[PDB]
Structure 1
Amino acid sequence: MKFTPSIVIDAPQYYVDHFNGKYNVDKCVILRDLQLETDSESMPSSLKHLTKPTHILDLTNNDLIMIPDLSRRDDIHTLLLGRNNIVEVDGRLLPMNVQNLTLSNNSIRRFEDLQRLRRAPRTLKNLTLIGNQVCHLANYREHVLRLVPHLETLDFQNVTAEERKSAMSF
C-alpha cells in the first residue's frame, strides 16, 4: 500500500492509559503492519488528514525510508516506527513535542545515519534503537548520548548521571 486519505482518516482511534495507569487519556492511532510505502507526492498531504489532537501515532511495520514529516504536530508525544526500513534519522521531521521515539529493527547502519538526531527537540526523553546495525558498533551508546545527551532512557537502559556527565563534556 501507499498513503491515501481514507487510510489516514479511517485509522483506529482509541484512548489508552499506558502513560497514566488509571485513566484512558492518550488517543492511540493505529497504522500497524499496513505496509505503507513512502512517497512524498502522496504521504505528507495524506498526513494533513491525521486527526487532531492525537498522541500516539503507531506506524510500526511500514515501508518508510525515513521518519515521516510530522514536524507540524504539537501533540504526537509518542511516535512508533519499529520494523520499518528507516535509514536516516532527521530530527527536523520529528513532532515538536515528541517524548518517546521507537526506531527498533530499522535499517540504520552508521553514526553518519544518526548524525542529524542532534537536531531532535530537547523534549525527547526516550529513544529505542535496538536491532539496528548501528547497535553493534563500538562506542555506539556513547555516540548516541553525546548527540542527544538529554535522553533519560536509551535502549531500555537508564542513562546514569555519569553517562550524561560524560556525554555533555564533548
Structure 2
Amino acid sequence: MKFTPSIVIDAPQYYVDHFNGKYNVDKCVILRDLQLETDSESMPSSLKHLTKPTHILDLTNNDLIMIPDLSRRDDIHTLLLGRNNIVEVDGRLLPMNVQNLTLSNNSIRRFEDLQRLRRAPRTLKNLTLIGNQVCHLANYREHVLRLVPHLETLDFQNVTAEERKSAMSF
C-alpha cells in the first residue's frame, strides 16, 4: 500500500529501452526507478532508498494525489505520472535536471495549480498535461507557455515563437 523501502529493494529493476538506468521498488506494491505501475501508490515517500541511481520513474496507474515528498535526486530526468489523480504540484520540487514530466490523465483543474512548474529552472523541456480538466479551460496553451517558457514541447506539440509572442500579448 505505502511506498516503503522494503518495497524499494526488489521490483523488476532494469534499464529503460532508452538505456535510462534505474532500480525498481516492489516487495508487494508501488515502485520507483523504473515501473511504479499498478500498486495503488497514495503518497510518494521514502525516495531516499532510491539513493539516486535512476534516470526515470514510471509512476503510472497509481492513486497519487499530489507530487511532493521528493528527496533530492540529481539523476532523475523523466517522470511518467500517467493515470493517477494529481490535483496539485508541490512547488519546491526543484529536482535539478528534471527534463520530462508526464501528467497525462490526471485531475489538475486550475491554471494556478500549474504555476509550480515554472520553478523547474531550464530543464523541464517536455511536459504533457493532456487528459486533464485544465486543458479545456480557455487560453490553456498560452498560459502554460507564458508561465513556464522553459518548456520546448507541450502536449507533444512544439512551442513556437508565434504563440510565444501571443502569450506575451496576453
TM-score (normalizing by structure 1): 0.79
1:137 is displaced (CA, Å) by 0.7
1:82 aligned counterpart, secondary structure: coil
1:42 is displaced (CA, Å) by 10
In structure 2, how many angstroms separate the alpha carbons of the residues matched to 1:47 and 1:23?
Answer: 12
Q: Rate the CA distance shift 1:133–1:51 in 2: closer, same or farther, 3 A.
A: same
In structure 2, how many angstroms separate the alpha carbons of the residues matched to 1:141 and 1:36?
Answer: 29
What residue in structure 1 maps to residue 128 of structure 2? 128
1:142 is displaced (CA, Å) by 0.5
Q: Rate the CA distance shift 1:45–1:62 in 2: closer, same or farther, 3 A.
A: closer
1:127 is displaced (CA, Å) by 0.2
Indicate the RMSD between aligned Cα atoms, in angstroms: 5.4
The gaps in structure 1 that reach 5 residues or longer are: none
Deviations 1:42-91 (A, max 9, x none): 96662111143210011111111111432501110001111111111234
1:31 is displaced (CA, Å) by 2.9
Q: Rate the CA distance shift 1:156–1:102 in 2: closer, same or farther, 3 A.
A: same
Q: Rate the CA distance shift 1:85–1:73 in 2: closer, same or farther, 3 A.
A: same
1:103 is displaced (CA, Å) by 0.3
In structure 2, how many angstroms separate the alpha carbons of the residues matched to 1:50 and 1:151?
Answer: 27
1:116 is displaced (CA, Å) by 1.9
TM-score (normalizing by structure 2): 0.79
For the Cα contact (< 8 Å) 1:14–1:27, is it kept in 2? no
Percent of aligned pairs sharing the same letter: 100
The gaps in structure 2 that reach 5 residues or longer are: none
1:41 is displaced (CA, Å) by 14
In structure 2, how many angstroms separate the alpha carbons of the residues matched to 1:12 and 1:52?
Answer: 17
State the number of aligned residues.
170
In structure 2, how many angstroms separate the alpha carbons of the residues matched to 1:35 and 1:110?
Answer: 29
